[PDB]
Design an enzyme around this catalytic site. Structure first.
Site: not given
Ligand SMILES: Nc1nc2c(ncn2[C@@H]2O[C@H](COP(=O)(O)OP(=O)(O)OP(=O)(O)O)[C@@H](O)[C@H]2O)c(=O)[nH]1
Ligand SMILES: Nc1nc2c(ncn2[C@@H]2O[C@H](COP(=O)(O)OP(=O)(O)O)[C@@H](O)[C@H]2O)c(=O)[nH]1
Ligand SMILES: Nc1nc2c(ncn2[C@@H]2O[C@H](COP(=O)(O)OP(=O)(O)O)[C@@H](O)[C@H]2O)c(=O)[nH]1
Lengths: 428, 211, 433, 51, 52, 49, 428
Positions: C172, C247
């Protein structure tokens, strides 16, 4: 904590951003009197991104309004949500631009930016940590280009680490509205080059195209036209006002969709759109939203993507829904329309999913695309500029208002140097 | 090799110049020149970056390297007048500001004219010093202004040996950082000496007290 | 006595953690408020102030508010001490630099401050369960800063981690590849075991075994959480063959680098379906090695399972596991390595899986197969070729360079990442000689 | 407007000076703590040398 | 007014480079404050090993 | 928690009382000045008559 | 238990103190008829600071109003709060001063000074302990300068241990109202220097600047100008009458703001000033209070404070506010302009809050400032006096009324003799 200061230049930007203020006042529950009448607790939760606090719960927008002609000020006053802003934000002047970039930049407008910047500065220092300015203007004609570019440049010299979302009405190919459109458009986008980070071009021809063929309106007026562009103006800044997964801010979008620091011209679209009579038959789901979105009739500017290649695209979705639907539709669009996407940037789509839907709708999503289709608009108005400029016509009232032939040639050379990278990246 | 395009490097350098990372802006503009030798606007911006950071001789050299192709180039004339001004040749700054004002009636050229005019009038005026044929603490206190505490904090950093031995960046050991700072202080104090000389400083009090 | 400081850094963590903690609470009784309407199955992850307030042990950090704000004003408003949810000001706008260089230092001192307090008041800091998003800003930027500034103090103490590897065909963030490469350049020389998970895989799994016809994040996180619950059972509830954090590391990270294992839950069966299956030790162990239940889009049917750590949670007779293991070591496909004859690491912790009011059904059995496949190199090469097409015409780089980082870094990273490929390759070759 | 801009540059210089003084205080704290560290280091090196 | 404006402008110009050297010196000092006590504790470990 | 809630409710009540106080004085000042304006205007009208 | 005796000299002094009595009579709850229709005990607690007593609740002010022509007494009597003063305190004289300082200081004013001193002694002896005398006048013109400074000299001699506040309105730079304002201001300040402890200079041009584009008024009257002066005049004496933490009285202000005995001319300012159309849009807090306080607008004397480095600043706040926010904003403004304060006086900020605001607002603040910016006003009056006096113009109606050249030469000598230190201390 995040805030954006809204600046409106010219009668075009004044009316468009005014309609923006009714749109987000309706979204945030603010009545014309300025107090609150709403339903959800999640509606005051980030009210002071656009609405500064005042005593008694009378929220006041953080916008400044500028024009050399003090009649658009009175129109905004006499409008429905007119008595909502601060009265010292209504910086006006007793002069006439005459649709001159030279008279918006090197005369009385340059004497009035001294005051509009001070008002902007009070609104910016009465804050916590600023993110962006949002200028509404029109590239064609004066004031919005004339004062617009000087306000652009001086506010960028003041605050050099802030996103300045500037949304500009571009001149149309079939019709035109102020004789000196090519001079003002090229000579303004010259200053828009080395200054802003997100310039969104909106064209009146595609505006009537979506008003007629899609909305099936009978007599569409500027109220509805500025309503469409104000909806796509409220669509981008929703993850910084309402909660939800995968939030997206102004630097989120800018760092995402500016591959090279000058190719920052984007193509917007608000696309859960349908006609008053079609809804009954229309089905509203994520695949239908994607198909009605990525089609080249919901584009807000008259630049077809079929004559070029997308670089990057964002879709800021809003509403309760699933997201496997949006993931599968984004990858399905990439795989179906594969020749029209750049290869040097893989996986070049954005999903930005705000939870809160707009009022009256169930799902929405604002399309923002960075195409190579801006080449046609730039080349067209460059041809018009050269056609006027080779004969030195409509020019003596810029030379006498304080300019020379050389600055115009610099502007056209720099804009042709804008036209070169957009075709080198279409030819890889 | 060189990997992106010239206007992209120029916009990058302008953004880093706005943000204040002057060394990276200078490196980006140098890469832009490696793309295209002799771009007057890029030399002007690279001169502006070295003017800001404090390397005045190369800021000058970039100013003539902008101006030799077109001696009527207003931005380069303004930059050369600015750099000659801050180097100390107020007379040459004044003549180049006059050339720029005559070529184009601009506010910055005018402002530079009153800058050099005040600088020359403060040192000379008309009665001035009487001259002779012939051939530190308080002085730098009134030359540096309210920066004197920053000055002596820098030498308090000089007078510690663990502060001499450092490992900042690849080789940018903090002794050299302190040298770059204190050298900027010394050049700025020398510039203030040329701007308002000490004899003008007691000329202030002598046009005073007796009045 | 045996605790584990939890740490969620970024939307990814905060969100997957709202679930992780929800699950940890309903695994005991702590009603969303702190009180525990009536034993040591608390110190492993929850403290206790004479007041019934069973306080959690996280640092839910995020350069930007919003994501965290929800937790603060949600059903779990209380639980998290009102200072263990360190927010910030602006966002890392997807920029390794922004969160590992610029707007990251401002909050780094505080983030470690609360980790320090947490540590001091913990008998035995077995390990830190960190949670980041390889592909993204904070999750990569702040994580580097954090993970790194955790060895400068609690070094010996291990540091496990869960991360959502930039998916293969989906993705994304257009600048996702960049972030990932620079982050595997830092973690590699810091972490102890990065159980990298992937969205695409979980997404599919949800459609083929849970009957969810439109999985969203909640659902995905829910599974990710139950996996962390599994790795954290021995250090809490009792059993027959327990396994501490040390472990899972001295039995799953062969050489001092190949420490990026892949995991998969077994009885992932929609409620209205289990009624037809016997979900027994065999079935679950077999389904655990299936080519389509792995939680990362990679083909184990194209690599060489170096070493595995089957951790069976629940009621599992400790003589049926041996049976399954054997009936799997004969099955050709599952190819092991010429340098590890011993199979996997059996482990039982009596305590049926919890049923956070959601989807995944209940089963008097369960197993989390944490495995070190040599196939993960395939997903590493993918993002490396992606970084390639990007670091070619200096694409989206001006944004990362004007944030504090040097073009040199993105380059240095590529080198290290390519060496990671060489490693997995060499470790896969044989040794007939 | 000239008087407004002059008051600007004066106030910017004043905030700059006071936050610079705050920086001097922070630097002095770090210097004194690391000087105590130097004293302990020099002592321990002396006993290791003699031993 | 113009002369005073440009005078104060170049004074403020000098002041940000003072800021830019102070921040980097602070960065060096806060980097050493992390690898202070661990190297100290390793030094007394050397001391006790040398005693034995 | 109960006592803190009662205390903050009392503070909100006294804030409302102070608001009512300043509004009723604004009314009384307006009434006094408009009586003064009335007497000035009637003096002017009968003098012009 | 403390009292302050009030003196009104001149037409300006009579009007400005009549409005002062209206404002503080509204503050203390006294009706037009004199009776106490109050509603707070704190209001009647220290009503005996400005009001002597009678039978039947008839609290009568301890003001003694003087003028040289018996028409302004009739005007003040015919005013709305006209039936509040004790009727034999109207010390009048059946003559006219004629805007002549000699005709008030050495002629027909002097045969009324005896009766004025008699009635001032009558008012002052009916007290337990006194702070001193506040006297309102016009610095230029007659009466308030003619009888005024002689009255200052006589009460300062006969009560030599009392603080003597003098609220003087000063001739403006742009215009003037009597030709001999340069004579009257110089001759009046020549006595004001070595007599008074706290002289507050208020300029009508600065009052117009405040009233036009801070209050946004279009038809401003002298009623509004003396209303602003009465606001700052009631604000300065707030802790002698109303309670609060960190109280400050007249002597405390005198010792905190008069470093040197001749440097006692101040520059006042009152600034919760909201226009009627923008009062709803305001965001009343002490940061905006401090900002509008220290912005070079709201000081009621037309001296630009940026052309002279401040000596000492005090702010007396009125209302309920946190002294944490107050005290950190006053640090923030002290560091916001640091080259505008003397560096040889550290921490040159006096703050003093009191609980009761001026009734009809919520928070208020009166600023009093000893600055070196009074050098421009005194130098301007000196230039006008020198231009008038070098040609011996408008002088025979002082020589024939009983003066010589020596008095005017010593008056200009004292003008310059106080002009030297106010420049000397601006440069260490
Ligand atoms: N399980 C889960 N995965 C998420 C979610 N939001 C984002 N992701 C994963 O994280 C990716 C992008 O979001 P992040 O990398 O977490 O963005 P961030 O670490 O919060 O960094 P910032 O947006 O700048 O705050 C996406 O490709 C998703 O696969 C979530 O709400 N739940
Ligand atoms: N969307 C929208 N566009 C408008 C509206 N009014 C004017 N425009 C556009 O504004 C352009 C001309 O604006 P201009 O005359 O330059 O305004 P100025 O800046 O005040 O001089 C035209 O091309 C119109 O298309 C409106 O109400 N809505
Ligand atoms: N603030 C205020 N100033 C006034 C008022 N009336 C007169 N003045 C000022 O008084 C000055 C002249 O008064 P003056 O001639 O001395 O009156 P006189 O003493 O009777 O001769 C003018 O400059 C006015 O600005 C008033 O009602 N309020």
């Amino acid at each position: 904590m995040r805030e954006i200061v809204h600046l409106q230049a010219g009668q075009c930007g004044n009316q468009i951003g005014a309609k923006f203020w009714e749109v987000i006042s309706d979204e945030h529950g603010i009545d014309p009197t300025g107090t609150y009448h709403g339903d959800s607790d999640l509606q005051l939760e980030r009210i002071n991104v656009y609405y500064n606090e005042a005593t008694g719960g009378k929220y006041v927008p953080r916008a400044v309004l500028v024009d050399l002609e003090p009649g658009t000020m009175d129109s905004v006053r006499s409008g429905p949500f007119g008595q909502i802003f601060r009265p010292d934000n209504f910086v006006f002047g007793q002069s006439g631009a005459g649709n001159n970039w030279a008279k918006g930049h090197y005369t009385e407008g340059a004497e009035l930016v001294d005051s509009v910047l001070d008002v902007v500065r009070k609104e910016a220092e009465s804050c916590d940590c600023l993110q962006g300015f949002q200028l509404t203007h029109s590239l064609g004609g004066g004031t919005g280009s004339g004062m617009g570019t000087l306000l652009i440049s001086k506010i960028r010299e003041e605050y050099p680490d802030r996103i300045m979302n500037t949304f500009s009405v571009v001149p149309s190919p079939k019709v035109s509205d102020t004789v000196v459109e090519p001079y003002n458009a090229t000579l303004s986008v010259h200053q828009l080059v080395e200054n802003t980070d997100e310039t969104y071009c909106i064209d009146n021809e595609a505006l009537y195209d979506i008003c007629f063929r899609t909305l099936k309106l009978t007599t569409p007026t500027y109220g509805d036209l500025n309503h469409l562009v104000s909806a796509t103006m409220s669509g981008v800044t929703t993850c910084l006002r309402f909660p939800g997964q995968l939030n997206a801010d102004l630097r989120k979008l800018a760092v995402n969709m500016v591959p090279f620091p000058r190719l920052h011209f984007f193509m917007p679209g608000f696309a859960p759109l349908t006609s008053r009579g079609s809804q009954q038959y229309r089905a509203l789901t994520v695949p239908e939203l994607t198909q009605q979105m990525f089609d080249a009739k919901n584009m807000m500017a008259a630049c077809d993507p079929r004559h070029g290649r997308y670089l990057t695209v964002a879709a800021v979705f809003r509403g309760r829904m699933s997201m496997k639907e949006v993931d599968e539709q984004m990858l399905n669009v990439q795989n179906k329309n594969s020749s029209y996407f750049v290869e040097w940037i893989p996986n070049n789509v954005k999903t930005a999913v705000c939870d809160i839907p707009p009022r009256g709708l169930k799902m929405s999503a604002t399309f923002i695309g960075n195409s190579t289709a801006i080449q046609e608009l730039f080349k067209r108005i460059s041809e018009q500029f050269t056609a006027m400029f080779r004969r030195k016509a409509f020019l003596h009232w810029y030379t006498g208002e304080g300019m020379d032939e050389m600055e115009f040639t610099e502007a056209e050379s720099n804009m042709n140097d804008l036209g070169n990278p957009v075709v080198t990246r279409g030819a890889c | 090799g060189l990997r992106s395009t010239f206007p992209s490097y120029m916009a990058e350098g302008e953004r880093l110049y706005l943000c204040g990372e002057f060394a990276k802006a200078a490196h980006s503009f140098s890469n832009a020149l490696h793309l295209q030798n002799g771009d007057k606007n890029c030399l002007v911006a690279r001169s502006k970056c070295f003017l800001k950071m404090g390397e005045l001789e190369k800021s000058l050299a970039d100013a003539e390297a902008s101006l030799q192709g077109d001696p009527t180039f207003c931005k380069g004339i303004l930059q050369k007048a600015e750099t000659l001004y801050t180097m100390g040749d107020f007379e040459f700054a004044l003549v180049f500001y006059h050339r720029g004002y005559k070529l184009r009636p601009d506010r910055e050229f005018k402002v530079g004219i009153q800058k050099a005019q005040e600088a020359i009038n403060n040192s000379v005026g008309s009665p001035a010093s009487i001259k002779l044929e012939n051939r530190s603490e308080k002085i730098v206190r009134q030359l540096l202004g309210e920066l004197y505490v920053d000055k002596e904090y820098l030498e308090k950093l000089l007078l510690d040996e663990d502060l001499i031995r450092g490992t900042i960046k690849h080789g940018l050991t903090v002794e050299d950082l302190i040298m770059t700072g204190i050298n900027y202080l010394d050049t700025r104090s020398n510039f203030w000496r040329q701007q308002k000389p000490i004899y003008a400083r007691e000329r202030d009090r002598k046009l005073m007290q007796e009045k | 006595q045996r605790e584990c400081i939890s740490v969620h850094v970024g939307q990814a963590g905060v969100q997957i953690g709202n679930a992780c903690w929800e699950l940890y609470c309903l695994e005991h009784g702590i009603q969303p408020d702190g009180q525990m309407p009536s034993d040591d199955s608390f110190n492993t992850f929850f403290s206790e102030t004479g007041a019934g307030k069973h306080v959690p042990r996280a640092v839910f950090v995020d350069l930007e508010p919003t994501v965290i704000d929800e937790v603060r004003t949600g059903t779990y408003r209380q639980l998290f001490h009102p200072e263990q949810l360190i927010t910030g000001k602006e966002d890392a706008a997807n920029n390794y630099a922004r969160g590992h260089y610029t707007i990251g230092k401002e909050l780094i001192d505080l983030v470690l401050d609360r980790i320090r307090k947490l540590a001091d008041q913990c008998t035995g800091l077995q390990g830190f369960l960190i949670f980041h998003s390889f592909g993204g800003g904070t999750g990569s930027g702040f994580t580097s800063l954090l993970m790194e500034r955790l060895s400068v103090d609690y070094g010996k103490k291990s540091k496990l981690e869960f991360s959502i590897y930039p998916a293969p065909q989906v993705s994304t963030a257009v600048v996702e590849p960049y972030n990932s490469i620079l982050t595997t350049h830092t973690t590699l020389e810091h972490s102890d075991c990065a159980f990298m998970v992937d969205n695409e895989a979980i997404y599919d799994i949800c459609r083929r075994n849970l009957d969810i016809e439109r999985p969203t994040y909640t659902n995905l996180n829910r599974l990710i959480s139950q996996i962390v619950s599994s790795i954290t059972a021995s250090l809490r509830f009792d059993g027959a063959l327990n396994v501490d954090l040390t472990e899972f590391q001295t039995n799953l990270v062969p050489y001092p680098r190949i420490h990026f294992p892949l995991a998969t839950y077994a009885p992932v069966i929609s409620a209205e379906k289990a009624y037809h299956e016997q979900l027994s030790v065999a079935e679950i162990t077999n389904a655990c090695f299936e080519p389509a239940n792995q939680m990362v889009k990679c083909d184990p049917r194209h690599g060489k399972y170096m070493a595995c750590c089957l951790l069976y949670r629940g009621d599992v007779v400790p003589k049926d596991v041996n049976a399954a293991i054997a009936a799997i070591k004969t099955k050709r496909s599952i190819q092991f390595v010429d340098w590890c004859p011993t199979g996997f690491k059996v482990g039982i912790n009596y305590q049926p899986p919890t049923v956070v009011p959601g989807d995944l059904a209940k089963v008097q059995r369960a197993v989390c197969m944490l495995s070190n496949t040599t196939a993960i190199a395939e997903a590493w090469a993918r993002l490396d070729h992606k970084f390639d097409l990007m670091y070619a015409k200096r694409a989206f780089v001006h944004w990362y360079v004007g944030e504090g980082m040097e073009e040199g870094e993105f380059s240095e990273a590529r080198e290290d990442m390519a060496a990671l490929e060489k490693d997995y390759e060499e470790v896969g070759m044989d040794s007939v000689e | 407007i000239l008087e407004d801009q002059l008051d600007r540059v004066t106030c910017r210089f004043d905030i700059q000076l006071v936050r610079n003084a705050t920086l001097r205080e922070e630097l002095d704290l770090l210097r004194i703590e690391r000087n105590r560290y130097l004293n302990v280091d020099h002592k321990l090196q002396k006993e290791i040398q003699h031993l | 007014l113009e002369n005073r404006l440009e005078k104060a402008l170049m004074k403020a110009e000098e002041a940000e480079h003072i800021t830019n050297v102070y921040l980097q010196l602070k960065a060096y000092l806060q980097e050493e404050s992390l690898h202070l006590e661990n190297r100290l504790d390793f030094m007394e470990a050397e001391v006790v090993r040398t005693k034995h | 928690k109960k006592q803190q809630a009662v205390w903050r409710k009392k503070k909100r009540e006294e804030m409302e009382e102070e608001n009512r106080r300043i509004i009723e004085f604004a009314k009384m000042q307006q009434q006094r000045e408009e009586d003064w304006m009335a007497k000035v205007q009637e003096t002017e009208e009968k003098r012009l008559q």
